[PDB]
Amino acid sequence: IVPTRELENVFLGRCKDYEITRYLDILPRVRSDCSALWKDFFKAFSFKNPCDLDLGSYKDFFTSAQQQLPKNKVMFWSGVYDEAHDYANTGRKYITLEDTLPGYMLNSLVWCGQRANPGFNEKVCPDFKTCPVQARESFWGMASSSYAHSAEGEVTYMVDGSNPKVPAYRPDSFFGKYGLPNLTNKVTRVKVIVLHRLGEKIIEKCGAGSLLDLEKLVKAKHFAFDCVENPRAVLFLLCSDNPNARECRLA
Amino acid sequence: IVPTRELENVFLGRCKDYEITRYLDILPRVRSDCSALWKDFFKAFSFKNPCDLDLGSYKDFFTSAQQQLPKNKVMFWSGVYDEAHDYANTGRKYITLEDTLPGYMLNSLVWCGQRANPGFNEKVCPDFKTCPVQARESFWGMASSSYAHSAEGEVTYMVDGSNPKVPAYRPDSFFGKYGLPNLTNKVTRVKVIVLHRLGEKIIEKCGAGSLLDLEKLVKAKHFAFDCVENPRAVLFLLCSDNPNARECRLA
Ligand SMILES: NC(=O)c1ccc[n+]([C@@H]2O[C@H](COP(=O)([O-])OP(=O)(O)OC[C@H]3O[C@@H](n4cnc5c(N)ncnc54)[C@H](O)[C@@H]3O)[C@@H](O)[C@H]2O)c1
């Protein structure tokens, strides 16, 4: 894959933008300045082969970068990037990882280490399905752990209930592996929202299949659990993009 | 009013973020680099009293910053910021001024010139109600004109149809003064979307009142014209935030 151009300039430009202007009434500022944060991010992978990473690599960066998160507002998602972010509505209804400082700075970017100066590969990065599991998941897995550990009160999890190749919930997704196990006693409830894509076969249902496995897990942690398929608020967002869909007919 | 801190760093940070990562398949890049744009911008207002700006002050800045705009996707909005940006969908369905480079860079920011070094005031700015209209409007007014001038094909205009105190179309709004007067013959049609807020009394309707004045003005510019109230796709977006409103009942 093609690495992000001007990585340091982009990281630093997003960081300063976020610091001064973004999520001011939703998330707290971090103590560390943008240059300290860059130093922690870069040392996680620089001057190393591109797959020489593990879950501990970005430890200092995520420590510096972590924010206290709004109680009852944390959301996770798997398989539903646009619908989850459209619904969270840039922190107004829920926070996603990608609205927090480390998530916002690195969202959509591509980078990797190399041993030779300048310590990072400006030409090519591995498909990363290519590196071993602990390396491929080093950055977003630590991102997910740290974010989960900071969640408080009700947490929401949006999943795709219409994908015949990928269960709504799986033990090895970033949420499965780094989210749920890292929810603490500050969390009171996991609220699942199952998306049923308009015009598509329903594959997964609350109370059955992988959602029942998730339910059992949630309860084993002593959180409450609820699950809803296409709640009206989410259904109308879907309809907005597909207003003639059968599901959208009004009275 | 307190000005944005670290204005230069914010502007440049936003400009680098946008250049490398934002609207990449939706809007073109600008030839000027971020440093050159900052110089143009700073030059427009600095070492002048804030009440001495006019519609020419940022002319050179907008000249450098102006992107060619995708045919048929240009949208104007009045009194409906959140609804218009949610519907426009960060450039995917429509472009707004706030998705373009200069609008993105200065959106929400607050700044002012001053006569002493360093030529701008980093700590306090005058409420703009104290200055002449042409100075209050010098930046966003030139922004809207430049943006209007670049529009081609069908343009869309989203208006509030449910304010008893503020007509859907006013000659003295930004669209009235800087948007419509500045549409060229590359524009073929103005399409009006009238927003009726859920649970509010309907004030304005297509073909009547200020909307008929606007219809007549558009036609006298030889643009085609159409007008809709709460088109399904827009209504569904409203409904997502108020699913239990009467207007949102499903079949
Ligand atoms: N913003 C990001 O780039 C990003 C990346 C990973 C994880 N996360 C966080 O963790 C959760 C999403 O991750 P998840 O695994 O639960 O859901 P998911 O399966 O939707 O994965 C999210 C990202 O990981 C990649 N991915 C997913 N399946 C893949 C596959 N089998 N092969 C190769 N790449 C694949 C995709 O690029 C996708 O953008 C969210 O809460 C999110 O905040 C975010």
Swiss-Prot record, chains A, B:
<dbReference type="GO" id="GO:0016849">
    <property type="term" value="F:phosphorus-oxygen lyase activity"/>
</dbReference>
<dbReference type="GO" id="GO:0061809">
    <property type="term" value="F:NAD+ nucleosidase activity, cyclic ADP-ribose generating"/>
</dbReference>
<dbReference type="InterPro" id="IPR003193">
    <property type="entry name" value="ADP-ribosyl_cyclase"/>
</dbReference>
<keyword id="KW-1015">Disulfide bond</keyword>
<keyword id="KW-0520">NAD</keyword>
<keyword id="KW-0808">Transferase</keyword>
<dbReference type="GO" id="GO:0007338">
    <property type="term" value="P:single fertilization"/>
</dbReference>
<feature type="disulfide bond">
    <location>
        <begin position="206"/>
        <end position="227"/>
    </location>
</feature>
<dbReference type="GO" id="GO:0005886">
    <property type="term" value="C:plasma membrane"/>
</dbReference>
<keyword id="KW-0106">Calcium</keyword>
<keyword id="KW-0732">Signal</keyword>
<keyword id="KW-0968">Cytoplasmic vesicle</keyword>
<protein>
    <recommendedName>
        <fullName>ADP-ribosyl cyclase/cyclic ADP-ribose hydrolase</fullName>
        <ecNumber>3.2.2.-</ecNumber>
        <ecNumber>2.4.99.20</ecNumber>
    </recommendedName>
</protein>
<keyword id="KW-0278">Fertilization</keyword>
<keyword id="KW-0378">Hydrolase</keyword>
<feature type="disulfide bond">
    <location>
        <begin position="112"/>
        <end position="125"/>
    </location>
</feature>
<keyword id="KW-0521">NADP</keyword>
<feature type="disulfide bond">
    <location>
        <begin position="15"/>
        <end position="34"/>
    </location>
</feature>
<dbReference type="Pfam" id="PF02267">
    <property type="entry name" value="Rib_hydrolayse"/>
</dbReference>
<feature type="disulfide bond">
    <location>
        <begin position="239"/>
        <end position="248"/>
    </location>
</feature>
<comment type="similarity">
    <text>Belongs to the ADP-ribosyl cyclase family.</text>
</comment>
<feature type="disulfide bond">
    <location>
        <begin position="51"/>
        <end position="131"/>
    </location>
</feature>
<dbReference type="GO" id="GO:0031410">
    <property type="term" value="C:cytoplasmic vesicle"/>
</dbReference>
<keyword id="KW-0597">Phosphoprotein</keyword>
<dbReference type="GO" id="GO:0016740">
    <property type="term" value="F:transferase activity"/>
</dbReference>
<comment type="function">
    <text>Synthesizes cyclic ADP-ribose (cADPR), a second messenger for calcium mobilization from endoplasmic reticulum; ADP-ribose is a minor product. Synthesizes the Ca(2+) mobilizer nicotinate-adenine dinucleotide phosphate from 2'-phospho-cADPR and nicotinic acid as well as from NADP(+) and nicotinic acid; with NADP(+) as substrate preferentially catalyzes NADP(+) hydrolysis rather than NAADP(+) synthesis, about 70-fold better at pH 7.4. Has cADPR hydrolase activity at very high enzyme concentrations, which is probably not physiological.</text>
</comment>
<dbReference type="GO" id="GO:0030890">
    <property type="term" value="P:positive regulation of B cell proliferation"/>
</dbReference>
